[PDB]
Ligand binder design. Structure first.
Ligand SMILES: N[C@]1(C(=O)c2ccccc2)[C@@H]2CC[C@@H](C2)[C@H]1c1ccccc1
Ligand SMILES: [O-]
Lengths: 220, 217
């Protein structure tokens, strides 16, 4: 199995900018027949993959000339001369020289750049309704931040809590280009009533120290 | 035009079986390496299998002995018989025609959802998320809605029956205890709430349920 490594995993650009995506294989993709079966595909949300470039540098019919491919052997590059909104999505390189199996890179998400933005953090205690059912989920939203990289940490009575945390992230907002995150700490009602201080902390490049939000159960 | 018409996907229990198919429209399989691919929940694009001219048949290791790819070159219909289905098989499947000469895939069928789970249809519990004391202040306030323990996807969620569309963030569902859980937040000026009402509306077609939850202090 040939492993395809793409870099970067995320490529933020501004409309009108040039974009360059790299793909490298664990072995030369030059077939014994002389051809190099390296191709580039683009997949948008809720859509099937679309062929852009085949055999390294052959642009497929209908594909704008803004896209061009190059490279040889083990290293390849997909270039976009002038990024347009329609180009946003996930780009995958694929090799079909050494098969089976056909393999693809993990993909490079082309996204938009914008000014940095600190996340707005909000914490929420378990609801009366959920508690009546025996469950206790504490929710924390980290909204409208940029860049997309962020980390959340939960603490119960001051101590770090890793178990029972589930996270979800939105795709880049189509209107303001920011990102948002939802983190939920689920415990049993029993465990929730055993402690009192609940905290969620966000670490983001817009602050040296984490943004902290907390509450005490017995206060509601 | 030229396209691939995909069949419906489906929900199956582990160890179960299911067959997907795609009909050619505007072309013939003759000369092409008809194949199946899948986008996993983790968002990785994987090749599953291919069949070229009846005998050149190939499979991804993980599915050898469970999935069978076949083709009706007379009717021009591609099949993927999935048996001994595992949870890891859950994904969006696509059929595509591969050029045997250049080895690329130009025509693709629309994605077909296949879910492997033991779960049974379950309506979600909708919990209101009210701000903690001392945070209902500020120029703006954020309210939330937790939609927990439903199956299968999806659910549709709105705020104030759609009147509140701006400042909303409804997150992708995640699995936990084999059931889905999703959340949504809405931010409004501190003036609006609580004096004015804010309600979370959740529809789950699979169970014919529609739940509304008012966010109260
Ligand atoms: N070996 C082939 C095949 O069917 C194939 C398909 C998938 C995996 C391994 C092999 C046949 C002969 C030339 C073409 C068609 C090639 C091929 C490779 C990769 C993609 C498309 C077609
Ligand atoms: O083959």
């Amino acid at each position: 199995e040939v492993v395809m490594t793409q870099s970067p995993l995320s490529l933020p650009v501004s409309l009108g900018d040039q974009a360059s995506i790299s793909c490298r294989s664990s072995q030369s993709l030059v077939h014994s027949n002389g051809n190099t079966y390296l191709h580039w595909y683009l997949q948008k949300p809720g859509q099937s993959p679309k062929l852009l470039i085949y055999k390294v540098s052959n642009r497929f019919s209908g594909v704008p000339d803004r896209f061009s491919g190059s490279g040889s052997g083990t290293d390849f590059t997909l270039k976009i001369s002038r990024v347009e909104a329609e180009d946003l999505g996930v780009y995958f390189c694929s090799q079909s020289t050494h098969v089976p199996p056909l393999t693809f890179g993990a993909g490079t998400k082309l996204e938009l750049k914008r000014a940095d933005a600190a996340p707005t953090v909000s914490i929420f205690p378990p609801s009366s309704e959920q508690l009546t059912s025996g469950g206790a989920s504490v929710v924390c939203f980290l909204n409208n931040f940029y860049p997309k990289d962020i980390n959340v940490k939960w603490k119960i009575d001051g101590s770090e809590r890793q178990n029972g945390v589930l996270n979800s992230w939105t795709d880049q907002d189509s209107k303001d280009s920011t990102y948002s995150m939802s983190s939920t700490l689920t415990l049993t009602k029993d465990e929730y009533e055993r402690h009192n201080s609940y905290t969620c902390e966000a670490t983001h490049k817009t602050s040296t120290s984490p943004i902290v939000k907390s509450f005490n159960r017995n206060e509601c | 035009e030229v396209k691939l018409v995909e069949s419906r996907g489906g929900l199956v229990k582990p160890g179960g079986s299911l067959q997907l198919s795609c009909a050619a429209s505007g072309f013939t399989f003759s000369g092409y390496a008809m194949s199946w691919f899948r986008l996993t929940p983790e968002k990785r694009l994987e090749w599953v299998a291919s069949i070229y001219n009846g005998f050149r048949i190939h499979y991804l290791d993980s599915v050898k002995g469970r999935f069978t790819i076949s083709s009706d070159y007379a009717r021009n219909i591609l099949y993927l018989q999935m048996s001994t289905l595992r949870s890891e098989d859950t994904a969006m499947y696509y059929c595509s025609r591969g050029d045997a000469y250049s080895r690329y895939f130009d025509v693709w069928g629309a994605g077909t959802t296949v879910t492997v789970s033991a779960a049974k249809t379950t309506a979600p519990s909708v919990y209101p998320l009210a701000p903690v004391c001392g945070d209902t202040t500020g120029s703006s306030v954020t309210l939330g809605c937790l939609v927990k323990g439903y199956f299968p996807e999806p659910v549709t969620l709105t705020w104030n029956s759609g009147s509140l569309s701006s400042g909303v963030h409804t997150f992708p569902a995640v699995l936990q205890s084999d059931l889905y859980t999703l959340s949504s937040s809405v931010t409004v000026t501190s003036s609006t709430w609580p004096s004015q009402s804010i309600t979370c509306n959740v529809a789950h077609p699979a169970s014919s349920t529609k739940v509304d939850k008012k966010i109260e202090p």
